[PDB]
Amino acid sequence: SMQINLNSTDPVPSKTPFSVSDADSYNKKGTVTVYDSQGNAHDMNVYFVK
Amino acid sequence: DENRNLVNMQGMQLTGYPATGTPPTIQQGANPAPITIPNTLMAAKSTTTA
DSSP states (O other): OOOOOOOTTOOOOSOOSOOSSSTTSOSEEEEEEEEOTTSOEEEEEEEEOO | OOSOBOBOTTSOBOEEOOEEETTEEEOSSSOOEEOBOOOOOOOOOOOOOO
């Protein structure tokens, strides 16, 4: 479970093709840590784009 | 430190957001990394507007 407060005045981004590295495609990045069946930790990045 | 990090008086490093780019900006979409004051040189900027 994950709660988030997003800003309503935040603009649509200029650089339109979505990628991972360049930090002007998305609006917000958040990170959750989960654990697999053997106990190794994995990191899920969620990216919120208006 | 010797490696010029930021460290409290017991020997533990102070983590933070790193800085990349020309000019460098903050990347909140990154992993937390130890801050380091660098011994490098500033880079020149060619003239654009007079």
